[PDB]
Amino acid sequence: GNTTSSVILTNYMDTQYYGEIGIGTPPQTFKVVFDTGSSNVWVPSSKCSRLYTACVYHKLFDASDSSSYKHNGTELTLRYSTGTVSGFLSQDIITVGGITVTQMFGEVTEMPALPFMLAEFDGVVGMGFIEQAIGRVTPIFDNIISQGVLKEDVFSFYYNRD
């Protein structure tokens, strides 16, 4: 229990900060915003129709390419101002920096064109609490805490200027 683990972020235009995670075996990589204002992990699903603009320019998670994927299928929905974000629960191995964690996440099958088509990243890693988690899905940082590998139960953000 002596590790700190870091993730380099990309700054897009002072409005979007994102870095890389890997989902599955072998790892399918995704750019994600690490968001203290939400508690879920979401990535687009290979099951998102190409008739959704937000899905056509982003990386899609494919369960049928992962050997460590465990099906769940519970439909879950996020209520956004521009429309509904919906998808379903899946479990797989998520790598963040030097850390591997088995995690439940949502695979998105539909989402409003806006603002999602304007994101340079593919998904979100929620860093908030189980209390605000849709479906009371255990947040990733809670699964990292449970591992007892961290030096401290903290995480920190640096954001540069562009």
Partner: protein
């Protein structure tokens, strides 16, 4: 260029200076703290009787309620467009400091911290890194301190002690 960095299990001293100052969460379950004021220049225009602040790393801007931001912008001379607020680019560098009263400290953003200075011309309009967003209950009504804030203040989210720590970011 290094766009940013998240550390899990610690912080990175090469990216902040001095020591952290901490504020306790209002209630566990959300990364929200008490705010005790917002100063334009040296006068406390807003949140004079305390309000809430969400420390939201997934937000681009500092946000307040429509009423609070109407008032903030009225004081900055900023004009409401459809989505954002703007100023004539030439007045950008003369905009007053804005301070957020959090814990024992004032967190001061200068104009360079919140004006998108894409030009210095009076014929051009420059955007502000502050927007109005009405966040519905339970979380809100609340301010949200997004990237605009985090850029200036290295932020630590502490689950062990249920606190948020701010130190001056080293760029």
């Amino acid at each position: 260029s290094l766009g940013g960095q998240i550390v899990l299990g610690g912080s990175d001293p090469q990216h902040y200076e001095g020591n952290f100052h901490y504020i306790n969460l209002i209630k566990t379950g959300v990364w929200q703290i008490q705010m005790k004021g917002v100063s334009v220049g040296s006068s406390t225009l807003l949140c004079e009787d305390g309000c809430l602040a969400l420390v939201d790393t997934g937000a681009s801007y500092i946000s307040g309620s429509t009423s609070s931001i109407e008032k903030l912008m009225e004081a900055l001379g900023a004009k409401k467009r459809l989505f954002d607020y703007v100023v004539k680019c030439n007045e950008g560098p003369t905009l007053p400091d804005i301070s957020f009263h959090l814990g024992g400290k004032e967190y001061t953003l200068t104009s360079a911290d919140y004006v998108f200075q894409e030009s210095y011309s009076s014929k051009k309009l420059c955007t502000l890194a502050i927007h109005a967003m009405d966040i519905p209950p339970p979380t809100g009504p609340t301010w949200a301190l997004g990237a605009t804030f985090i850029r200036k203040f290295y932020t630590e989210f502490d689950r062990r002690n249920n606190r948020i720590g701010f130190a001056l970011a080293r760029h």
